[PDB]
Design a protein around this ligand. Sequence first.
Ligand SMILES: CCC(/C=C/C(=O)O)=C\CC[C@H](C)C[C@@H](C)CC[C@H](O)[C@H](C)C(=O)C[C@@H](O)[C@H](C)[C@@H](C)OC(=O)C[C@@H](O)/C(C(=O)O)=C(\C)C(=O)O
Length: 254
Amino acid sequence: LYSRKEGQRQENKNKNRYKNILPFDHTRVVLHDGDPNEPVSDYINANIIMPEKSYIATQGCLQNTVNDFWRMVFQENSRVIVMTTKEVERGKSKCVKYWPDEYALKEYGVMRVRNVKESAAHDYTLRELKLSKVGQGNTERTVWQYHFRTWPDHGVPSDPGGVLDFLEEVHHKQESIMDAGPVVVHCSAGIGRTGTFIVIDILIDIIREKGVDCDIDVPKTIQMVRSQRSGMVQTEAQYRFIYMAVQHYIETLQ
Ligand SMILES: CCC(/C=C/C(=O)O)=C\CC[C@H](C)C[C@@H](C)CC[C@H](O)[C@H](C)C(=O)C[C@@H](O)[C@H](C)[C@@H](C)OC(=O)C[C@@H](O)/C(C(=O)O)=C(\C)C(=O)O
């Protein structure tokens, strides 16, 4: 009940930044209505992560997966994107530029993206973009891209403050959009940094509906998200960052 067949198919080998980091088939994001000329067009390295508000854990775009990325965003109806990495860190590409330059607009396949406005904050940049299907400007929607950019080249942030203030914002943005789709989260492989944010965001929403006293079980939550995408949270720094984040959030509310 836990296969990764599709991700291993010969035709999707170029659609993964790491041959060894693949999506489970049951939680795999299936892409419909793609170019009928392509051998396979229903694939993208991304999994739906639903607590048990949903999330989409994926890798940063590859030069050849950018259109797939937007098709996913359009289909799933996502309205918020969380980029947890720079395009390149320590001379290594983690995500290709998949959004247009300021005030510009590009067409990625059948998807038109207009960069409406870019605004900076301490740890991140917010990009207001308009997504629509070419020729059908009756499908346009705004997608808010939250680009975290101060994450350290090595290890994790020494203080959770930034990430928390960041996620509070992403949070209210998501709840201000009527029935917005899953929140897309992505880093280089979509498991390490990506898992950490999601796990944190998940635990924080609990402390929201519940109170600063509810039963919080980190290992259980992590285990839970890993059953939907393996690798979620890969380092000890990340692991401990989650604990710190949660405690910091608690102490903040007080
Ligand atoms: C935009 C560039 C381009 C187009 C060029 C063109 O216009 O023509 C094409 C990209 C080609 C291609 C997809 C990329 C190419 C470099 C080769 C693919 C990988 O580079 C390769 C498997 C590899 O060998 C990488 C590893 O050496 C890697 C560092 C290892 C130690 O490390 C990890 O596995 C990353 C991991 O620690 C990690 C992270 O914190 O980055 C994770 C999980 C995370 O938090 O997300």
